[PDB]
């Protein structure tokens, strides 16, 4: 509780300069100490990338064994997040390296989960989670606590994709009470926001707006809320100030295209949707792609196709969008239920 005392001081007494103060104090610290090891978490759980990358360098080449470990493991995690490497090579590098610390045993498991979630590839997550135990960490109480929040958040997403919405919110809410890290707060609110998309427009917007407030300041955290607010509004067919028209990202384009649909410009929506079709996209994105086509043409093939991609993606929340459409075209309700489950 050296590091912890330092962070708690800055957080309370100098709040709106936290990053300036904690940068200096982190970069000064000796790699070998617990504080430096504790600091690495602070840096990464906050997504302060440059600072995390700097701390990695110092710690990768260091006398203490634990610090050497942390350096090497976060080295992988940050190569994975920047997308220098794929999931498969990350899994090999954890298998190759021999993990001695109980903490880095726990953190190694969570490494791929981040990539899965980003890539829409939801199938592997559930199984990977069950093995982890948080009492295997009983050494460094700061690293123990942030990992609690990390797991509460990851599960909040896992149950979201499993279409266990009451549970998703439970876990996000847990995460919120457990932390005052912005990023964890940001993603808690994102996931509660997402959990209500179909349930209740109002509560979705509340949770997405409340997170949006916390996110302002950060270019990257804003973008998630803006994208989800676009989606929310386009799906409920409401006024939509959230759209970014100057983005090539398939998910921003997808938001444009969803907007024209709501404004009934189906020729222009069709043209642009065909331009996305062969572009690089994860399967979950194709889930939406064909759902969009289904709205334009009203062809069952599109909706059938959209279901197939969500099925591949194992996205049990968003599979219901094409399934509802298919029900309204007089498809056998029982067969559609079999798909939903």
């Amino acid at each position: 509780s050296e590091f912890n005392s330092i962070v708690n001081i800055v957080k309370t007494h100098y709040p709106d300069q936290e990053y300036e103060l904690m940068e200096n104090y982190c970069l000064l610290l000796d790699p070998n100490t617990k504080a430096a090891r504790s600091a690495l978490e602070y840096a990464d759980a906050n997504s302060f990338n440059t600072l995390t990358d700097k701390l990695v360098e110092k710690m990768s080449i260091a006398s203490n064994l634990k610090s050497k470990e942390y350096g090497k493991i976060y080295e992988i995690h940050r190569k994975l997040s920047r997308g220098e490497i794929d999931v498969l090579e990350a899994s090999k590098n954890i298998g190759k390296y021999r993990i001695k610390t109980d903490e880095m045993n726990i953190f190694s498991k969570m490494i791929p989960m981040y990539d899965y979630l980003s890539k829409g590839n939801f199938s592997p997550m559930k199984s990977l989670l069950k093995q982890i135990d948080l009492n295997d960490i009983k050494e460094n109480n700061y690293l123990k606590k942030s990992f609690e929040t990390r797991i509460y958040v990851l599960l909040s997403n896992i149950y979201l994709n499993e279409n266990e919405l009451e549970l998703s919110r439970k876990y996000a809410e847990k995460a919120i009470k457990s932390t005052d890290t912005k990023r964890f707060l940001v993603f808690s609110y994102l996931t509660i926001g997402t959990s209500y998309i179909f349930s209740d427009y109002a509560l979705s917007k509340q949770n997405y707006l409340s997170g949006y407030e916390i996110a302002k300041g950060n270019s990257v955290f804003e973008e998630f809320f803006k994208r989800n607010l676009s989606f929310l509004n386009n799906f409920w067919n409401k006024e939509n100030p959230w759209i970014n028209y100057d983005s090539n990202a398939v998910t921003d384009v997808q938001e444009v295209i969803f907007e024209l649909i709501n404004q009934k410009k189906l020729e222009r929506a069709l043209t642009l949707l065909k331009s996305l079709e062969r572009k690089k996209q994860n399967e979950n994105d194709l889930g939406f792609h064909y759902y969009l086509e289904g709205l334009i043409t009203n062809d069952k093939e599109a909706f059938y196709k959209s279901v197939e991609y969500f099925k591949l993606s194992q996205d049990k929340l968003f599979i219901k969008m094409p399934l509802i459409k298919l029900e309204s075209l007089g498809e056998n309700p029982r067969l559609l239920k079999i798909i939903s489950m």
Binding site: Y114, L117, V153, L154, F187, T191, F224, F231
Partner: peptide
Amino acid sequence: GVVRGA
């Protein structure tokens, strides 16, 4: 598209 972060 709907994004999810963790």
